[PDB]
Design a protein around this nucleic acid. Structure first.
Lengths: 433, 107, 75, 74, 179, 18
RNA sequence: GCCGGGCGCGGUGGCGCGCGCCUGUAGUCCCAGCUACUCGGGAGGCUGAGGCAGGAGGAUCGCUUGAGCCCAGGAGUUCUGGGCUGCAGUGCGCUAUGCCGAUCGGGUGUCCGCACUAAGUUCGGCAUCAAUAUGGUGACCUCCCGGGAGCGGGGGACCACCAGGUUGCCUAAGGAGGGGUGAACCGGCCCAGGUCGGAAACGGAGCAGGUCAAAACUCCCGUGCUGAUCAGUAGUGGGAUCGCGCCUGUGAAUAGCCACUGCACUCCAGCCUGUGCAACAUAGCGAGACCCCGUCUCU
């Protein structure tokens, strides 16, 4: 099923093998029957499963070549490497442009999150390091305008569609000119929200295409639909050779895995998936990662961490002031922001041992609160040396009306100010001892 | 539409600017929103306790020092709920007088 | 009474020796009558002798030595 | 008479002997214990006398003798 | 006992500032001199230094008030202090005219003291702009100084005469206000 | 790098109870 | 022969005899007592010698004292002189340097925290007033009015200071003066952020920061009173010699060498004592005795 359910079923199937007193055809056939049943609940097309099973079974029986690997590991390696095929061998880069010109055309059935994925592909190209503008060529739908402009004013991206004066083809052409003297480094332009794929999405699309020589045409397709993804992909591949696909809402309904399998079969290059809602939840088809999460591995908690950028270089200059002893008040914010960019992991609450409530925020209910808890503002409302004291808490013992004035100055109560104070000493003693 | 009664209003240990609304002569030691509600509800007044609200002019964050109390004066039609309670001042005072009698204080 | 030349010289040497402490020696010479008489005395004891050409030689040197060595007290 | 220098007394004596080489006689007296000599030449009527306590004289005398002893024997 | 007031002040004044009008320096000179005097000195009287000392007290105040008027030229708050110093200057001058009436001090010195006291008295009233009272004091001063001047030769009287020449402008000003 | 950076990150989250 | 003599001492009844010394032209050997007194014997040579007198040289000695000179040791009045010279009187003559300021003369200066004065070096202590007209503010107190909040509108009371001014039975001094701090919870103002209240708008308190004649506090000049470390400082009086400094003075010298004269302390000789004296010039006196000779004497 979804990331978590196929993950567990697949993970469970993988696990039995590790505890193996001897590995035999029988055990093979049952572990392979559990990962057969697992993909089918994720809606991976059953001809697709069949083929992939006898691929693994043959790899795992006839050619039993474990050179310096245990039988188990070389079984795991099989069941791993075949799933990365099942979801498209490798990663399909989006090509950046040199000079000043990349024209990208969004298409999408109403229901998929094309509208949200436009602004999420805007977010990417400011992460990749270019300027991107939004031509909002979908015309009738004025809730589409509403959200998409709101998404654009939160980040920093020019959006052009205005009030309904002109037809689509002409408000594209005038949108491109409006941002071609303003750097046309990438344009992201969406055709409107149509009912079905049957001569509604594409029958329009290539009217819009004919005005602007499209450098990649991306189709935002809803994972929810599962293995109807393929019948979509087929159609778009054929009509448009420069199609890519972006597979959205991986959370939610359990057809995610078979949404992935099905598009990846066509050979229509999957270019993105959506991992959920926030602006940064738009991952660059990390299908190597995703498929690892599926088989498990899992894991995937070191994976996002180590792989990320501020982790080899920028685990140094924070990391010395840590190791000398310059407190943490200057590490709170950094770690709450440098990570604020958020990448969800289970291990987020692995360090703090505490089986009690959720359980379900495994998960980001901390992120969901607009900022990252009320800590910054009592930090600002301390004096710099009130922090830099070798025990700032000692200062709020000795003088008692510091804990009142700093509570009022930040806007907390004294109770929540008292929580931070003892938390600081809690990190301290722990590390000492 | 109920009205607001913060303990600061009835605190004889607070100055004017600190939120006192009644003469020190009638004010009280350290009234707790709870006690305020307990004496108001026991006179026939319609009232509910907003346990976690905090008075803006209250630097402290402790419990004995926070909470808010809400009492209904008039009725949707307009008639006062209790003739003896026109204004808010009326309630504040009535409270300031009855709390130093609560068993929990005479103890 | 005359003494043999040699003997004379011995007695004389003796006179001088006896008169050192406190006394005086007298010696007198005169032509004997060729010879010459020689006499010496300390006051009481008296010695004499005759010296001739036959004997002047052995005698003079001897007599000469006697006078020289025995008259010492002078300045 | 007595004389104060051997010089005078010498010729005085020699001359006297000369004027009578037969009566004249010469005596000598030495007293060791008193440390003095004493020569006298007489004629038994004339008398010459020399007294000394100077050693420088013993030779002058031993000579005189040796001289008178020569005349007496030529 | 003897004390020649006008001659003392005129020679102290000219040597330590008032040649150029520097009342600060001269007042300081009066203060330090008063230090020396009291130090050496430390029943009516014995010596004539007591008389010199009190005069220095009257001189200090007087010079100050004069420094002040150059300053209150722009700082009217000082003019209040000016008048205080001047009223003090007279207090010490009266106290001086009090000491010189002891009968072991000659009458020439009696004259100087009452002429000095008149001078300052003239000055205070002249600053209060009390034109009749001030002119009384200025004439009293003029009268006594003229009395001193006659009893001496013209040479000795030169100093006295230049002082009455000195206060004659002051006398003139008072007049044109009581016209 | 991966060790400390990852281990400090880990040690911090556990120690800080909120 | 006739072939020494003298002086002194000694056994001794007595002397030969004994000893020492000096000397004359002069000696040798052997043996021994006669004997109560008083004197040995023998050899060698020979008519020349022995004894004594006298005498020149004095070869010749002694004694003694004297000259001359004073020996040895030592209290000591002074006639006489001396050693050191004491004491007294008198002052010559000569010489040098002297109003380019000498003895004599006055005044003052020099190191000065003892007087005066210059410029004071340089450091301190203690102080620095009120009455008023009006405007300014900040706080507080007591009310009225509107309102669901924040809050807004209006009447007073009082306290604090500030303001350019006006004045005082007020002062030794009283400048309507200057700067700083104004911080962690006690000035005011402007207050990001946060915070409280508010649908919102905005407001309330108010931190960080900034700002101020107007909360307080403090420092500074100005000012008086009260003290001055220490004055390698300058000019005027004082203090040990006046030496070095300055100005002048009556006045005309001063310094040095010594001379003559009388008397003499203390010590000394002339004093006292005893071996004062050898013979340096020489004394008295006595005398031994050779050389020559007188006299007597002889186998």
């Amino acid at each position: 099923m979804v990331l978590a359910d196929l993950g567990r079923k697949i993970t469970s199937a993988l696990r039995s093998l590790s505890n193996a007193t001897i590995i035999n055809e029988e055990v093979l056939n049952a572990m392979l029957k559990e990962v057969c049943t697992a993909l089918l609940e994720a809606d991976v097309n059953i001809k697709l499963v069949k083929q992939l099973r006898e691929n693994v079974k043959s790899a795992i029986d006839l050619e039993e070549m474990a050179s310096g690997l245990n039988k188990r590991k070389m079984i795991q390696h099989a069941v791993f490497k075949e799933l990365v095929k099942l979801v498209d061998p490798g990663v399909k880069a989006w090509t950046p442009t040199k000079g000043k010109q990349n024209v990208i055309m969004f298409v999408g059935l109403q229901g998929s999150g094309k509208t949200t994925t436009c602004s999420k592909l805007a977010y990417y190209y400011q992460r990749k390091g270019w300027k991107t503008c939004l031509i909002c060529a979908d015309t009738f739908r004025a809730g589409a305008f509403d959200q998409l402009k709101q998404n654009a004013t939160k980040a920093r991206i020019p959006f052009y569609g205005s009030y309904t004066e002109m037809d689509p083809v002409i408000i594209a052409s005038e949108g491109v000119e409006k941002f071609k003297n303003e750097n046309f480094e990438i344009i992201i332009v969406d055709t409107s929200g149509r009912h079905k794929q049957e001569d509604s999405l594409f029958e329009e699309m290539l009217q819009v295409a004919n005005a602007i020589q499209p450098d990649n045409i991306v189709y935002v397709m809803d994972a929810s639909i599962g293995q109807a993804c393929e019948a979509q992909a087929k159609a778009f591949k054929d009509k448009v050779d420069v199609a890519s696909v972006i597979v959205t809402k991986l959370d939610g309904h359990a057809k995610g895995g078979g949404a992935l399998s099905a598009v990846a079969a066509t050979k229509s290059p999957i270019i993105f998936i959506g991992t959920g809602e926030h602006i940064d939840d738009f991952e660059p088809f990390k299908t190597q990662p995703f498929i690892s999460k599926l088989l498990g591995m899992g894991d995937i908690e070191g994976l996002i961490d180590k792989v990320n950028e501020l982790k080899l270089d920028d685990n140094e200059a924070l990391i010395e002031k840590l190791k000398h002893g310059q407190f943490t008040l200057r590490d709170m914010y950094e770690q709450f922001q440098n990570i604020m960019k958020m990448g969800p992991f289970s291990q987020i609450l692995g360090m703090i041992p505490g089986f009690g409530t959720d359980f379900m925020s495994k998960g980001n209910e901390q992120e969901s609160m607009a900022r990252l808890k009320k800590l910054m503002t009592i930090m600002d409302s301390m004096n710099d040396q009130e922090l830099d004291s070798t025990d700032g808490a000692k200062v709020f013992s000795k003088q008692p009306g510091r804990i009142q004035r700093v509570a009022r100055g930040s806007g907390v109560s004294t109770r929540d100010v008292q929580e931070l104070l003892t938390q600081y000493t809690k990190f301290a003693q722990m590390v000492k001892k | 539409r109920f009205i607001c009664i913060y303990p600061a209003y009835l605190n004889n240990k607070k100055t004017i600017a600190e939120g006192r609304r009644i003469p020190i002569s009638k004010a009280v030691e350290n009234p707790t929103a709870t006690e305020i509600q307990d004496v108001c509800s026991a006179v026939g007044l319609n009232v509910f306790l907003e346990k976690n609200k905090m008075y803006s002019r209250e630097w402290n964050r402790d419990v004995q020092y926070r909470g808010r109390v809400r009492v209904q004066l008039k009725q949707e039609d307009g008639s006062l709920c209790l003739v003896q309670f026109p204004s808010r001042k009326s309630v504040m005072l009535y409270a300031a007088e009855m709390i130093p009698k609560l068993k929990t204080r005479t103890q | 009474v005359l003494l043999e030349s040699e003997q004379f010289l011995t007695e004389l040497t003796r006179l001088f020796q006896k008169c050192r402490l406190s006394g005086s020696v007298f010696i007198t010479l005169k032509k004997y009558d060729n010879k010459c008489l020689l006499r010496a005395t300390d006051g009481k004891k008296k010695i004499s002798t005759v010296v001739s050409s036959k004997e002047v030689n052995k005698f003079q040197m001897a007599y000469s030595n006697l006078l020289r060595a025995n008259m010492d007290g002078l300045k | 008479a007595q004389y104060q220098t051997w010089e005078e007394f010498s010729r005085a004596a020699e001359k006297l002997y000369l004027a009578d080489p037969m009566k004249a006689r010469v005596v000598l007296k030495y007293r060791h214990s008193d440390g003095s000599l004493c020569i006298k030449v007489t004629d038994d009527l004339v008398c010459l006398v020399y007294r000394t306590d100077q050693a420088q004289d013993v030779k002058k005398i031993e000579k005189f003798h040796s001289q008178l002893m020569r005349l007496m024997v030529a | 006992l003897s004390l020649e007031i006008l001659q003392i002040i005129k020679e102290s004044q000219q040597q330590h500032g008032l040649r150029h009008g520097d009342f600060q320096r001269y007042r300081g000179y009066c203060s330090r001199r008063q230090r020396r005097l009291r130090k050496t000195l430390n029943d009516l009287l014995t010596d004539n230094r007591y008389l010199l000392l009190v005069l220095m007290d009257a001189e200090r105040a007087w010079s100050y008030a004069m420094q002040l008027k150059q300053e209150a030229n722009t700082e009217p708050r000082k003019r209040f202090h000016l008048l205080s110093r001047l009223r003090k200057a007279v207090k010490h001058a009266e106290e001086l005219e009090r000491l010189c009436e002891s009968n072991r001090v000659d009458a020439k010195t009696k004259l100087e003291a009452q002429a000095y006291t008149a001078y300052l008295s003239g000055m205070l009233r002249f600053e209060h702009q009390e034109w009749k009272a001030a002119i009384e004091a200025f004439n009293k001063c003029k009268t006594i100084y003229e009395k001193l001047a006659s009893a001496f030769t013209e040479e000795q009287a030169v100093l006295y005469n230049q002082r009455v020449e000195e206060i004659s402008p002051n006398i003139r000003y008072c007049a044109y206000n009581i016209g | 790098l991966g060790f400390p950076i990852n281990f400090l990150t880990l040690y911090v989250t556990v120690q800080h109870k909120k």
